[PDB]
Enzyme design. Structure first.
Site, PDB file in Angstrom:
ATOM      1  N   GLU A 179       0.802  -1.214   0.000  1.00  0.00           N
ATOM      2  CA  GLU A 179       0.000   0.000   0.000  1.00  0.00           C
ATOM      3  C   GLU A 179       0.830   1.256   0.000  1.00  0.00           C
ATOM      4  O   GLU A 179       0.306   2.281  -0.448  1.00  0.00           O
ATOM      5  CB  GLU A 179      -0.917   0.019   1.228  1.00  0.00           C
ATOM      6  CG  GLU A 179      -1.777  -1.257   1.266  1.00  0.00           C
ATOM      7  CD  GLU A 179      -2.981  -1.141   0.399  1.00  0.00           C
ATOM      8  OE1 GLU A 179      -2.945  -0.029  -0.245  1.00  0.00           O
ATOM      9  OE2 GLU A 179      -3.913  -1.918   0.380  1.00  0.00           O
TER      10      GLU A 179
ATOM     11  N   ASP B 148      -7.980   5.578  -5.207  1.00  0.00           N
ATOM     12  CA  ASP B 148      -7.396   4.316  -5.531  1.00  0.00           C
ATOM     13  C   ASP B 148      -7.695   3.970  -6.988  1.00  0.00           C
ATOM     14  O   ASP B 148      -8.483   4.654  -7.658  1.00  0.00           O
ATOM     15  CB  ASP B 148      -7.879   3.270  -4.501  1.00  0.00           C
ATOM     16  CG  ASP B 148      -9.279   2.879  -4.603  1.00  0.00           C
ATOM     17  OD1 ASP B 148      -9.890   3.277  -5.690  1.00  0.00           O
ATOM     18  OD2 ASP B 148      -9.830   2.264  -3.722  1.00  0.00           O
TER      19      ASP B 148
ATOM     20  N   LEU C 134      -9.298   3.443   3.265  1.00  0.00           N
ATOM     21  CA  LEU C 134     -10.380   3.955   2.450  1.00  0.00           C
ATOM     22  C   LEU C 134     -11.246   4.933   3.196  1.00  0.00           C
ATOM     23  O   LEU C 134     -11.933   4.475   4.108  1.00  0.00           O
ATOM     24  CB  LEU C 134     -11.238   2.793   1.837  1.00  0.00           C
ATOM     25  CG  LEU C 134     -12.488   3.270   1.095  1.00  0.00           C
ATOM     26  CD1 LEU C 134     -12.350   3.086  -0.408  1.00  0.00           C
ATOM     27  CD2 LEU C 134     -13.662   2.432   1.530  1.00  0.00           C
TER      28      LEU C 134
ATOM     29  N   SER D  28     -11.434 -20.054  -5.852  1.00  0.00           N
ATOM     30  CA  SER D  28     -10.072 -20.073  -5.344  1.00  0.00           C
ATOM     31  C   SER D  28     -10.095 -20.233  -3.821  1.00  0.00           C
ATOM     32  O   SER D  28      -9.201 -20.798  -3.254  1.00  0.00           O
ATOM     33  CB  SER D  28      -9.237 -18.884  -5.753  1.00  0.00           C
ATOM     34  OG  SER D  28     -10.151 -17.965  -6.257  1.00  0.00           O
TER      35      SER D  28
ATOM     36  N   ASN E 136      -6.510 -19.340 -10.769  1.00  0.00           N
ATOM     37  CA  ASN E 136      -7.816 -18.827 -10.597  1.00  0.00           C
ATOM     38  C   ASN E 136      -7.742 -17.386 -10.091  1.00  0.00           C
ATOM     39  O   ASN E 136      -8.520 -16.542 -10.461  1.00  0.00           O
ATOM     40  CB  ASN E 136      -8.600 -19.687  -9.606  1.00  0.00           C
ATOM     41  CG  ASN E 136      -9.570 -20.653 -10.240  1.00  0.00           C
ATOM     42  OD1 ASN E 136     -10.648 -20.907  -9.689  1.00  0.00           O
ATOM     43  ND2 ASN E 136      -9.143 -21.258 -11.332  1.00  0.00           N
TER      44      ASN E 136
END
EC number: 3.2.1.17
Length: 164
Positions: A11, A20, A32, A117, A132
């Site tokens: 990040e 973002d 966020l 997955s 996947n």
């Protein structure tokens, strides 16, 4: 090398508001602010969070604080989650960090989507879950980070994070 140091690499750290890959206003270490499109609405969220009138600017310190609370909430998010918990419980420590990395990034809902997955992870099918995982928009949006994460589930090591 632990969950905090991995997330930090992925990040990065940004003291001013930013958007973002999906167009969301974010700050710090991937925190966020909100899903609402307004920059004012986001700046309100930031102040209500940092507790002070920031003007969309924060210190290393307040970013570190959001980071600790974000890692913590990601973890209790996997544990309250009926899809996520059993996969988490079923994993080793390194792999466990991989899944917190994902939930940190896209939330419990975003990750619970990954049914196939997740199923493969719970079955120890390292190789097939990776393929996947790569067959996805997540991968296309954030491909180098996605690669690191994927390899982490692959090999069970921190290699992706220690080598160029």
């Amino acid at each position: 090398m632990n969950i905090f140091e991995m997330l930090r690499i992925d990040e990065g750290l940004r003291l001013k508001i930013y958007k973002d890959t999906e167009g969301y206003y974010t700050i710090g270490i991937g925190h966020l602010l909100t899903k609402s499109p307004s920059l004012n609405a986001a700046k309100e969220e930031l102040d209500k969070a940092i507790g002070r009138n920031t003007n969309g600017v924060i210190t290393k310190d307040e970013a570190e604080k959001l980071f600790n609370q974000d890692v913590d909430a990601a973890v209790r998010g996997i544990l309250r989650n009926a899809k996520l918990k059993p996969v988490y419980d079923s994993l080793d420590a390194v792999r466990r960090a991989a899944l917190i990395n994902m939930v940190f990034q896209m939330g419990e809902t975003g990750v619970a989507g990954f049914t196939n997955s997740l199923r493969m992870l719970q079955q120890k099918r390292w190789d097939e879950a990776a393929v996947n995982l790569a067959k996805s928009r997540w991968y296309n949006q954030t491909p180098n980070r996605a690669k690191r994460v994927i390899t982490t589930f692959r090999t069970g090591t921190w290699d992706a994070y220690k080598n160029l």
